[PDB]
Design a protein around this nucleic acid. Sequence first.
DNA 1: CCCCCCCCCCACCCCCCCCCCCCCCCCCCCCCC
DNA 2: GGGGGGGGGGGGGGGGGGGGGTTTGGGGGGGGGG
Lengths: 665, 421, 101, 52, 656
Amino acid sequence: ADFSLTVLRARIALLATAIGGPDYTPPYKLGDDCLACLKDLKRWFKLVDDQQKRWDVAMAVAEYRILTDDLLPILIDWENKCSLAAKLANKAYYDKIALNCLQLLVLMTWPLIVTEQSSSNQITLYGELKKHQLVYKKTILSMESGKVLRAAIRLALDVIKIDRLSRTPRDNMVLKLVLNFFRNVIAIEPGEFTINTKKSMPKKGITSIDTLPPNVSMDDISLNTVISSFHKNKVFGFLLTLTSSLSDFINIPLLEIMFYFTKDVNQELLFPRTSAGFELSKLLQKEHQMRKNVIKHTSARHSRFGGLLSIQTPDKTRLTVSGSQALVDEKIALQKLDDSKKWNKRIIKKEGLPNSLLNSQTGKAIFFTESNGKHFKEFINNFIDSGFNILLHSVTNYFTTEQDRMVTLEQVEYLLFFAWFVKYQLLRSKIDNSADIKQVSEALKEVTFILVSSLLRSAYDLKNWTVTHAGMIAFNELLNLVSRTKAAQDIEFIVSRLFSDERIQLLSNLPKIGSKYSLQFMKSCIELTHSVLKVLEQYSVNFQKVQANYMTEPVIETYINFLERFRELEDDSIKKVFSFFHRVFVQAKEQALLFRFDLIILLREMLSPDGLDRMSRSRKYVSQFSDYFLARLKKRLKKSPAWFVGLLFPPLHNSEVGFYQRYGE
Amino acid sequence: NDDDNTEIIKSFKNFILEFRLDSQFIYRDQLRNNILVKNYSLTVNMEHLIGYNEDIYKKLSDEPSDIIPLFETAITQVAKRISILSRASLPTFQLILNSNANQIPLRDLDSEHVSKIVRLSGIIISTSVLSSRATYLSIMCRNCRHTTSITINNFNVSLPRSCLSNCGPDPYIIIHESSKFIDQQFLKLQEIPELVPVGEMPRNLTMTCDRYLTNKVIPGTRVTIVGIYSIYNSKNGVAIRTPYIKILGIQSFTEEEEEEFLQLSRNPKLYEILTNSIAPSIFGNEDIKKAIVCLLMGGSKKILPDGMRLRGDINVLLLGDPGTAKSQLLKFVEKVSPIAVYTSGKGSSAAGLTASVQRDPMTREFYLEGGAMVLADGGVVCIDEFDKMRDEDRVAIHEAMEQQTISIAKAGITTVLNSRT
Amino acid sequence: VVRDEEGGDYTIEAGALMLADNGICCIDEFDKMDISDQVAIHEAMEQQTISIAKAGIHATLNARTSILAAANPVGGRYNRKLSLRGNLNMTAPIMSRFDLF
Amino acid sequence: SPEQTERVFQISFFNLPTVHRIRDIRSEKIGSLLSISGTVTRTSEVRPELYK
Amino acid sequence: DIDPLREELTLESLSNVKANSYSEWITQPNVSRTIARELKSFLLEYTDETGRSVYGARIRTLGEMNSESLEVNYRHLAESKAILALFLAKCPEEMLKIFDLVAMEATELHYPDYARIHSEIHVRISDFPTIYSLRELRESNLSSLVRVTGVVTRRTGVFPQLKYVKFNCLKCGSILGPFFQDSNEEIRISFCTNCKSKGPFRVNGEKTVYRNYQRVTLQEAPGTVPPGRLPRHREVILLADLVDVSKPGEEVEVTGIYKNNYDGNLNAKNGFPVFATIIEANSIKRRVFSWTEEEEREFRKISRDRGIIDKIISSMAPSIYGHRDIKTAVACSLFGGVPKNVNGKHSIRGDINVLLLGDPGTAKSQILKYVEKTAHRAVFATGQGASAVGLTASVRKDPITKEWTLEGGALVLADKGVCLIDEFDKMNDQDRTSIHEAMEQQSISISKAGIVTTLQARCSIIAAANPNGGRYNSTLPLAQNVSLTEPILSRFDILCVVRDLVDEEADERLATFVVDSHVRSHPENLNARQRRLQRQRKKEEEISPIPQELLMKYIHYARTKIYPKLHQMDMDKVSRVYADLRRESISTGSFPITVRHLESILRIAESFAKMRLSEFVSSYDLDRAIKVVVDSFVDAQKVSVRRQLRRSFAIYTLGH
DNA sequence: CCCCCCCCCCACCCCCCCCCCCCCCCCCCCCCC
DNA sequence: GGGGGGGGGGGGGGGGGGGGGTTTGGGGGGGGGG
Ligand SMILES: Nc1ncnc2c1ncn2[C@@H]1O[C@H](COP(=O)(O)OP(=O)(O)NP(=O)(O)O)[C@@H](O)[C@H]1O
Ligand SMILES: Nc1ncnc2c1ncn2[C@@H]1O[C@H](COP(=O)(O)OP(=O)(O)NP(=O)(O)O)[C@@H](O)[C@H]1O
Ligand SMILES: [Mg+2]
Ligand SMILES: [Mg+2]
Ligand SMILES: [Zn+2]
Ligand SMILES: [Zn+2]
């Protein structure tokens, strides 16, 4: 009964007044029994919300604003006490309330997941609870330039001073909880707007997906604020010296922080590869091309002015359209007739992990401030230059064990970590000769390959498509690195036989299945496939034998369905698709498999005036391909007019006519 | 609760049948005598109901809108028992209340008086035409022709929302031949002028009466009303309601004033007596006072064999110097004359003099409303400072003063009104 | 005093001596103004208010204005053989309200 | 402390290149920043528009 | 540790607000219970400097009046438990519900079973420090308590409105629990909570209770609105005890809540989601004449001075030098006579009407402007600024009801007061003729648009006028000095003739007085505020035998409490005076002596006795009244005869 | 030239629409050839 | 190893229910008569 909930909220409100407040004689001042009150609040979290799976206390604590109005004041004032004392050297007690404040922050910032195992109460309360965590993240990053962050590192430093052995289990746990605090503060992110599907949709959809609370803007939550507050509290320095000092109880949270820093930021944004106004002028010219295009597709006179075109077909029958531009351009008339159809084919549809490169829209970017850009790129630079190989060895040498018990989230975050920093160092080393590929040498050490192979193989066998996609990305970066070191050169030949047979088959099977999965899944399949083919060509077991495993129709469907997003794709992605087509069609000469109308449609749309950029390099590749493709299609139809029907359909898997269809004698 | 209503009804029946003072059963006598002259009502003094059994008065005054119909029903049953030999048809009798509860002045009535029996007083400033309200509706379903009925008590019903055993959504209709109706009239009561607060505009109430209380008052009469202060949700604020009174009683020749006026007629000094009695504080002006007596009495109105009709009304103009007591004489004549209206020439407009168009807020439809001449019909219109009146107003006086009519064509309403003034 | 196009009921509508409140009012051809209007500004010149009672709306609006009046003498041409009394069509109620000529 | 709301910000441009007349209103300039001139005939009651 | 139904907080915890909005904090039940205890302690323990509890005494008085309203002074709450004053300012709708419950608790403690007399108490928040003009209100004031100045421009009727209302669902088991009605919108029932579905709904006729309701259009004061702008307005809503506390055409000061609501009409016509707004009034104050028991005793004390009449008359318009006959007439008018009615048959005017006729620059307008500040009910109108209807009464077709209603003119607004008509000579005669009825018969008899009625207009009219052509000309009699006719002139039953004669010893004293008065009025000329008030008091005593602040309360007291009688007056003295005045008034150009002038002597003698707070009129009052009227007549003459008339009438006046 | 007049201006059925329910189609998964 | 058949989800159509759709007074401007 809700009587219990209002009683609980009354209790937490009374506890909220017990913690402390401002003293007018303004400074924050602790309450009587304040340590016992903090312990009792920790006990409320345990006693009710954990033990009964409710999150009611986690809601009530936010209602009475304890985190923002008591705990961060306590920690920041305690930080100032200890800072001033350090310069000028009953802290034995106040240390305890600082620690219990940190425990409460770790609890209240603890990441939220919703599953079939969650209670009905939890999944009901999930949204507003996420919103309150976002207010917490804003306050933690903003308040006194986030001085509580230095409070957290100081609490950790006061057990890093003592010996490696002298750090007791309590000290080890305390350092781990400090890492979980920083991880959580990175990890809070706006929740998904999750809708009941029993009742039908109205005549309009959801009015907005925005789930922020009114006192928050997205910039308050953005990475930029994280970088600024972490720099101004030297959290980056703390993490860098911590990973340098590793010489392993805390290694998994320490990896996890770097994952949460990397999961959604693109490496190219840290490299350039009147400047802002100049580039804005470039952007505006580019969209002005689309303006002149739609203007060509627009009437010179008012909408009520419309006369009627009639398209008499090649047969003695007539259609009718009102388009004034179409009246003098039959292309527009035909396509407008097709646009007018009310009918569509109905299309069928298609969680405990955060948003990332695994599931973001493919053009998403963090727009850094240049100070934060410098601070972040130099932080991850110094990490790579110190902490990478040691950390990766520590955690991968963990993950050699306990693979059967590795939780799905842990698997995907490990794979993303691997991929992200390997990709970054490859890119930086392409940009700087001063940067060295050997600085990520741990990636190529054979245990790492074996584990990544075990992860991808088990994920695919389990049909865990999330982790399969993660391992697919990690494999792409492993192969990418392999190609770079094959040029920069032994271990290359080791992995180039260890990946034989069933691994070749597995890699050949992802782009068969990819057509059934999201754009990013398909993109990673294409990326992996391009890397695989360039690797095998660089080596060249037999080259014809392997590529035959790729040149099959579901792979062509996956490439087509990827290419169907052509406007939203990037020039390099289209280049990779058309290099694959160059191989299949020009080099391998299995041209019959691409004589199908879906490709014809897609080629026309992208070569259209409202298709690709006229100046695009990828448009040049498409044009080159299309010229050769049309010439061969004309030639095959001239030799075989049955293909005028066959163009409509999948090719005949009946070999006895299929060979004749494929080659025409 | 029908047993409880039956015991209320039987309690009232016992009150009619048993109440007696000084050896006379006053309400049995009054009910029988009312039946003989074929007015089906009973006038009850609530002092007597209190004196009989104050529990009944407490029930009545706690919720009159439920208790009054039961009292009416009890009166019908006793009426039959005292005027028809049963085992060898009358309508629903109207209850009429007399009271001496302390009056609430018309301005002080507010939300705490809603549905209480209230006693007040004022001037009736308008009296609408009669209107027909249903008492018994004979009701038919449009599809299946299932017939039923509504018996109505007019103290505050609607047609039933759907058929009382597809039959359509909103199906019922009234059978106007078998349904029974009663007369209803609307009155507007203005507060007594000498009770208006300083600098206030005089406030007024709309109020309703039915059966034998219709046509019982005319505009300008000063009355005391007994009624239920009550509410209705008009079409024209938010969560607001229009107040009104449902009248339950009105108080506004006798066989000995007949004798008094015979004796006064027989007095030889009568004309001097009446002359002295006009404006007694005004010294002198003897012939003018004599003429005012003549104007008050009037001549004799006549009709000829041709249907032609001749003025009985006298018109008098007092033209003269300042401070000669002219206005004082007019403001006296407005007191003594049984029907009178006082206006001043500069206060007038032709509309407010003859008659005007109105749109009734209750029906929300047009009706014509009488001006000063009509309200003075049967008496004197005292037009003070007449020399200040505009020319068009003095034109409008002509028909009402000499033809003693007002001819109308306004809002499409063609009409002619009488002005014996 | 006018009807409001929004509310429909009456309202005050500001004349020039209100726009010139805490300011100056300049009148050309003042002697050729109707006496109907010369007797209207008498309050504003001295009591520095406009008092109104019309259409059931009552007001006393501020008219703290310095008035500057361009006047012609009677018949247009001045004659110093006459008094300033005789040179003007004005009379003592309005001439006394002016400070200096 | 009591919650202080987020502050709204108005970006008031001024000193534009030219003033267009009311008669120069032409619908391609919909959504464009302009400067305009005329004489004010009436001004409304100040009311709260529901912003968010 | 403690029962959750009784957990309660410290005052510093209340200062330590830790819900998000203030209202979210007030509605937290521990905070609510604490606030209840806090306000109860405030009412029972805040005191006067005498140590007497303020709200103990105000509650005692509340019960004696059987009132529903308790006037809590906000400044008291700001002095003690100031956090509650902050919550009351920032969040009045929640706070006032709590404070109402607390106030009912306090008075139920003081009077057992006051729940039988009223089921509720409303606190009225008096003396709220910050004030806004109607132009000055904004979005940031929404839901805030405000204190506003304006004039009540249009007041509707006293309608009932729903307060607590159970509703009936016409499906299922019908009843729904009681909704509380606001001032802004109709109740909505999205679904019936029993059947959890849509349906028809209807008011439950047994369990519903009503309160009084009245909208008022409140508008900017004309002495406040800046130039070049339309005056702004808001719909005030009055509830319960506040209805008809004011009447149109009067200034008010309004403590209330500035609340908005959705309205599809405003959105429709404006094309933006723009909300309507009101001021839900919490208290209304009119904006001096009220007095205390010590002030009553002071009036008695000073009145028995045998010189009080002349000290009053000198106090009239004290910075106006000389003009003692004007000040006498103004004193007589402002105290008035006694209205009468013989047996109900013959009502007699009590008011005294005064005309100031004279030259330019002789303070006539300033005398009227003095009386405008000095009288309890008064209004001021000038010349072509008036109209006949704007002066007596008018009618309008109400935009709400579409019925015709009266609206009072100046002589209705000044009922039981005095009406001030400047430039009486330069009104149109089609406006002047409207004065006649109200000025003598004390009434206005409208017959317009179906309305036919007589209003009370008990006014003394004081009028100021210039003679014909521009100034007075004593070669002529009155009937040629002025355009006004005998009827209207006979109603002005004292005439003052004012002349600007050059006279050196009078002009030097006058000019010295005017210059002294100018510097004594210059702007630059027990704390600092009180100290300059004490200097101001001595400056007032430089010219005024009694304070104006005292005189106004003395006037209002004398008017409302004192009713003189002509016990044993000298009949033959008055009768011979009237007979001789009538005989000498046979001169066809002279002031028309009439029976109403005889009544004027009697009214004036009553007014002088009223100045003495006297139950009985003395010979001295009647002699002074005769002398005033005789002087008024004698000076209304061409100078060729004035000396002879003065000599003849001297036998009546020079006995005193 | 001044004042008064008078003229103007203003305050029950049928359609659209929405909600609810049932069926049919299309995809996925498993078995059979 | 591919194609058919069974089972479940999702979308579209069709039906049913409901709500909406001129007089009177006042002020000011403008023109005509004494
Ligand atoms: N003969 C009289 N006897 C007694 N009182 C009189 C007499 N004549 C006049 N009065 C008084 O004088 C006043 C007369 O007022 P009123 O009735 O208006 O006179 P009037 O004839 O109407 N003059 P006017 O209104 O200017 O046309 C009242 O106050 C009377 O009491
Ligand atoms: N006796 C006086 N004492 C003081 N001030 C005076 C006196 N006589 C005239 N004044 C001044 O004269 C000025 C004008 O006064 P005012 O009230 O307009 O006189 P008035 O007689 O009404 N002139 P008018 O409006 O043409 O009839 C004011 O500012 C007064 O201060
Ligand atoms: Mg008269
Ligand atoms: Mg003056
Ligand atoms: Zn039926
Ligand atoms: Zn229901």
